Amino acid sequence: GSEVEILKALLELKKSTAELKRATASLRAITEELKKNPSEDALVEHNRAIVEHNAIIVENNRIIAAVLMLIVVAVGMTQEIKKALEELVASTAELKRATASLRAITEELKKNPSEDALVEHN
Amino acid sequence: GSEVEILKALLELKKSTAELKRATASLRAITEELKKNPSEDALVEHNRAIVEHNAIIVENNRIIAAVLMLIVVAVGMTQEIKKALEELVASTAELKRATASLRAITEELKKNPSEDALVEHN
User: Fold this and answer.
1) Buried (b) or exposed (e) across B19-56, using 16+ Cβ within 10 A?
2) Helices (H), strands (E): how many in chain A?
3) A39 CB near a chain B CB, below 8 Å?
4) CB-based contact B38 A39, cutoff 8 Å
5) Backbone phi, then psi, for A54, in 5-degree steps?
6) Does residue A55 contact residue A23 with C-beta atoms inside 8 Å?
7) Residues of chain A neighbouring B40 (CB-CB closer than 8 A)
8) How far apart are CA A40 and CA B117, in angstroms?
9) Which residues on A lie below 8 Å from B49 (Cβ)?
10) In this structure, how many other beta carbons lie within 10 angstroms of the beta carbon of residue B100?
């Protein structure tokens, strides 16, 4: 379950990091090459839009991974919860047996109020 | 004093308003005409900078006038303050005369403690 989902989240962080590094490299290549001749308006404006789009995508990937890590941590407790439930089920069944026993004792004690029945009640 | 300063502030408001109206007219003429051919980069970028500069100047003129109106209102009370001071000065002089009179009475009462001197004291 979470063993693979988390490995994929780590792969995502690796890829969004590489994207950030490359987007930053183009950000700078753009500033240095385009300031040489501002008349190349389409090239500088298109590349700046590209850089902003990548920066947003990187930030979104970070947030998405941050949320999915909370889902993953909830998932990783599956076996601990399963064992807690098995214990709760066994406890419920034992409580039921004790209740049925007490009911039978109550009926026996009222029908035949022997001292032994009072001892069994306690 | 404030009679002219305030007239000048009103003239300023009239002129900054006319500037705002003209800056707005160019803002719109620029957007509508330049979208026809975005390749005229120098014209659109220079005129947008012009519009931003004018918008800032108009806002600053508004704030400056708002402050100067507080100085003007303080200035307009010159005659009311002058008259209050004239009253305070006359009061101070009268208080001094009363104090000197009381001192002389005290000396007369101690030197010759006639009942009339006690009456004058009260």
Assistant:
1) ebeebeeebeebeeebeeeeeebeebeebeeebeebee
2) 4, 0
3) yes
4) no
5) -70, -40
6) yes
7) none
8) 104
9) none
10) 10
Question: Which chain A residues touch B39 with a CB distance below 8 Å?
Answer: 41-42
Structure tokens at A4: 């693979």
- Which pair of tokens denotes residue A47? 């590349």
- Which resolution, in Å, applies to this structure? 3.3
Task: Please give the structure tokens belonging to residue B116.
Answer: 């009339």
Helix axis angle for B41-75 and B2-34, nearest 10°, is 160
User: Which residue precedes each gap in chain A (C to N above 2.5 Å)?
Assistant: none
**Measured distance CA(A30)–CA(A48) in Å, rounded:** 8
- Supply B24's token pair: 């707005």
**Residue type at B113?**
P
Contact A16, A62 (CB under 8 A): yes
Please identify which residue in the block is written with the tokens 């001094």.
B96
The amino acid present at A28, given as its one-letter code, is R
Q: Are B16 and B58 in contact (CB under 8 A)?
A: yes
Q: In angstroms, rounded to a whole number, what is the distance separating the alpha carbons of residues A122 and A109?
A: 11
